[model samples]
Target: GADHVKGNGKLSTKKITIDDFNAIKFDGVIDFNYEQSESTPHIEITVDENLHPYVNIDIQDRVLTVGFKGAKVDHFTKFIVKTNSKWLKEVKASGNANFIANSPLKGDELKINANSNCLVQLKQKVEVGKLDLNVSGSANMVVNELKTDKLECSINGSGTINLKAGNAEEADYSITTDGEIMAFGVAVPEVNCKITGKGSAQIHPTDNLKATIVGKGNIRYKGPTAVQQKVIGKGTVEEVK
Candidate 1:
């Protein structure tokens, strides 16, 4: 979602020329051939085996319409989204995958999960200033080890986003996952932070936020890029304290 949040503020903004925007679409289980380059950013995705994935490309408008059902993968693969020269604004995944990582998401809209499972790995360096990232999964959402300057991100789901780290500095970063936010950190305060739609936000030592629940189901914080997040509706929070 670092891409789709509405407002007038500078995130990782950039511009490029694209020859094809309707290059990707799916009808079934399709695996993308993603090629990484600073010259061209690609979008590689995977979908469920049950649901039908469709793509409609309007070359005139440079618009791509994508639709899919959640899928589970046996192994990991990368599906290319865009190439040649383009800027990515958002990427929404709605399936279960073994791993997903850095895919040059600058000047993008959002990365949303429509009830999916993800084990995302950092493939490249991430310099996103504003990302509207929300996940709704039936399984775990894992964030692999990566080091960046700072991050302003949040998660809202009924499932778990497991932060698995091999090192403390790599794993010890700021994040807020609505519902149950779990971390595998070995530091004081444990980096075990939690938030509820009603209760107060418990800030972990690793958290670079001064947080408070503003209204019902809303949590506010001062974070990177002046980031603010809320898990609206009904929710609860607890820590492994």
Candidate 2:
């Protein structure tokens, strides 16, 4: 009665009560969503019945990890996850997972790492003291209304980032490969943007602006203040409308 038959499919849903966890890591093909909660932290998982038996959820040492037990399942096996935690610090996601947070997220120091072909989206306000955004391996991250004191973003591979309505005191964004960053909405006092390979970025700084480019990448900055820039190879650094 604990096993499911092969080639038969059914949907299952369950909610598991969990303890407090500051960090979370995701592996495999899963679509996960999170929100802020004042009550107990729990996870609601909706997955195929055939694959539910293989679902693995573990929380140890203030870190929660979710994934499958074995590797015999096909790529079509997907998990829909919704969770809430009162305290959250960081998140690490890989594989084909898609992570989303639609509610207001607050933290002291928040770090987000998205790798592989995954996508990370924050569609609402995010208030944090320090924000670190990392993307690699064709992943994409889009954030809106990000209010932070310090913002740092690093992207590799063909990944991309779109940050809008950002209110930050300072920002340091860098990218490699063919990645791109469009973060002109960050009203920062000082900003530094660096790119290598064929990457590109667009930023807006109020007080000071620094753009460093290598290869054939392009850097477009918005500001009329003092400019400290560098360009190597066929890159271009422009400060105009």
Candidate 3:
């Protein structure tokens, strides 16, 4: 994220220092693909020939922001980043794009705000303190593992979230539309989940769980026990052995 933009509407594609960054923010109508560099810890950027949108890269207060600064273009662009992750704290993505980061996110938090038909996949073990996701479009997210204590998520549109974590300290999830949130083989000590407007949620093996469903939504849990469940307007909470 330490790379700068040039007058030719392209990135330098050169190695730069990323050891002094705390957060990386991305914006605009661009596609982002991430690759893991286990040996080196730096930033490198590149773009397709047909895709030459206005670019802005700035570093302030140890926070790096890469954003689009001109008219929208219907071309594809790709970014390659290498992070040491010692000072990196968070990664925030906004606007419409496909974000595919296969490498493990070694930060304190990961936040995403999808405004269009975006496909986001961070399908790796998260070594962060928290994971926050807010989806407003038809996007699908897959998290293979979570090594955090707190997990928070909300879906306001038709989307799907698939999570697989061994266990967590706490989890809070909410769905306001006909979306689905599913967690497989995860053990959370405390879980607070709410569903409405035909939304559905599924969890497994929780210790102490509290769930509420409304407006024909359904919640299914395969945990040992289900405590303090409230359903209204034809909603149901089912417990599976």
Candidate 4:
């Protein structure tokens, strides 16, 4: 069932509730939060009359899908996503939806597709095993702090990514089509990355980092004085001196 509540603000509010399945027992989940406009989108697992822009959730075959309907461009909705579950098998976001995660998400894999924009600032650190990010048509992702064992990240088109906690042990990263991939405050022992088509990549520092470039863009880095690196192709790799 769905309900509408009046807001003291300029926009009307709506809410949808789903109580069919157990909220804690999901293996995989998909979130489709789409909006054409720019606003303070808020989404959470709990119900709040003050929060604008939300989605209805459904689960099948251990796959949960959260979808937002009737989002406008002029007065777009901002969202906050909250979860009580400690962990999930997979999580995905798509479309032009703006998202803010209000909880620490533990998962085996995290995927972002299309123009989905996600900004996560965790009160606590988050850990993930793998990341599959497919950015196309100006999608972006920013993480304040993250701990991961392995990362498989790729950016295409005009997508951009900024990861603050670059303590991942191993990473297989790639960027293409004017996209930008940056890692701030990295302590990785090794990384394998490729940049092409005017894509730019920057990292804080590492013991050993390798890049393969075939574009006019540049790769920059900072600390870990004893650097071991190899580059092939027409790209430039320089220390952020």
Instruction: List the candidates' TM-scores in order.
Output: 0.43, 0.93, 0.77, 0.67
TM-score for candidate 4, residues paired by index: 0.67
The candidate that achieves the highest lDDT relative to the unseen native structure = 2
Candidate 2 Cα outliers beyond 4 Å, as residue runs: 1-7, 75-77
Model 4, span 53-134: residue lDDT tens: 4444556764556544334222223333343333344444555545444555566665545454433223345577865555
Q: Who is ahead in lDDT, 1 or 2? A: 2
lDDT of 2 by residue, 1-241 (tens): 2332332356688998977888889977789998877978888888777667777888999898987665455544357988888877899999978889968889898899999988999889999999999999988899988999999988988898899887899999898878888888888888888888998888888998888888898888787657788888798988768
Q: Worst ten-residue run, lDDT, model 2?
A: 1-10
Of models 2 and 3, which has the larger TM-score? Answer: 2
Better of 3 and 4 by TM-score: 3
lDDT of 1: 0.35
The digit string of per-residue lDDT tens for model 1 on 98-198 reads 33444533342324342355434434433343333344544345444323222323455455554333223211222333443444332212222335443
Instruction: Kindly report which residue stretches of model 3 are placed more than 4 angstroms away from their true locations once superposed.
Output: 1-19, 34-41, 50-53, 70-87
Ten contiguous residues with the weakest lDDT in model 4: 20-29
Query: Candidate 1: misplaced stretches above 4 Å?
Result: 1-19, 22-63, 66-85, 97-99, 102-114, 118-121, 145-152, 162-179, 182-194, 197-241
Write candidate 3's Cα lDDT for 1-241 as tens digits. 3334334345445446554555667765545555444545465545543333454556788777775555554444454433343444555665655666667676667666554556677767676677787766766777788777788878886787878665667888788967888885667778888998888888763577788888888888886865788888788888866
Model 4, runs deviating above 4 Å = 1-56, 68-84, 114-124, 225-234
lDDT of each: 0.35, 0.84, 0.67, 0.55
